[PDB]
């Protein structure tokens, strides 16, 4: 599924990012939108360790999920990697969740780093009523 910016914002609020370790739900937006355009199925195999990024979030498989084909990997959410690809997002939410349980926080993506940090992402949220 590709959502709609503001079908998403609502979804993300009602399941309980808004502020999740004092993470916005525009910084969440800002996050989905880069990573891959607000889509469910994207995935994304990086030649260069094995490994692929799930999903809205574009989760890896080197550490968040399970996808049996990742070398020496984890799998910290405890999901097989294609429940980062349903249409509905509450376990990719969850997961993301548990990433920003850790140090890094929201910074564990880098394209969040290159076009979120330090940015106003209030347009993200604007005007869907969240």
Not at 11 to 16: D, F, S, V, Y
Not at 53 to 82: E, M
Request: positive net charge.
């Amino acid at each position: 599924k590709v959502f709609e910016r503001c079908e998403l914002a609502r979804t993300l609020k009602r399941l309980g990012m808004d502020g999740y370790r004092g993470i916005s739900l525009a910084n969440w937006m800002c996050l989905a939108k880069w990573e891959s355009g607000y889509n469910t199925r994207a995935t994304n195999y990086n030649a260069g360790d094995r490994s692929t990024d799930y999903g809205i979030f574009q989760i890896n498989s080197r550490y968040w999920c399970n996808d049996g084909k990742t070398p020496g990997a984890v799998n910290a959410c405890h999901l097989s990697c294609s429940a980062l690809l349903q249409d509905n997002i509450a376990d990719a939410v969850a997961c993301a969740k548990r990433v920003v349980r850790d140090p890094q926080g929201i910074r564990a993506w880098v394209a969040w780093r290159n076009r979120c940090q330090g940015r106003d992402v209030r347009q993200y949220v604007q005007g869907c009523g969240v």
